[PDB]
Amino acid sequence: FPAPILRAVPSAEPQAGSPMTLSCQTRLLFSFYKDGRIVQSRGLSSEFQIPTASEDHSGSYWCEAATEDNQVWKQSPQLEIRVQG
């Protein structure tokens, strides 16, 4: 059971104002981090939605897949988001 891959869809470079989703690709619960702080706490969903990309969304993100009691616990490599414009 390998480390999650964090993917940006459609890309890590959304145009400003456009929607994108972060996907934690891997019972596991998923959390998402930006620049050290949680942006979505543990949950069923392996997706972190950003429906309107703006400057504050640019940064270094990573995700975490883990069971409730942390018997299983793994994080992804970081992924930089660069909102364009």
Q: Which fold has domain 1-85?
A: Immunoglobulin-like (2.60.40)
Rounded Cα distance, 85 and 76, in Å: 27
Q: Which residue has the tokens 């930089």?
A: 80
Q: Which residue has the tokens 């939605």?
A: 49
**Resolution in Å, one decimal place:** 2.0
Q: Where are the domains of the chain?
A: 1-85
Rounded Cα distance, 67 and 9, in Å: 25
Contacts of 69 (CB under 8 A, 6+ apart): none
Under 8 Å between Cβ of 67 and 28: yes
Q: 44 forms bridges with which residues in the sheet?
A: none
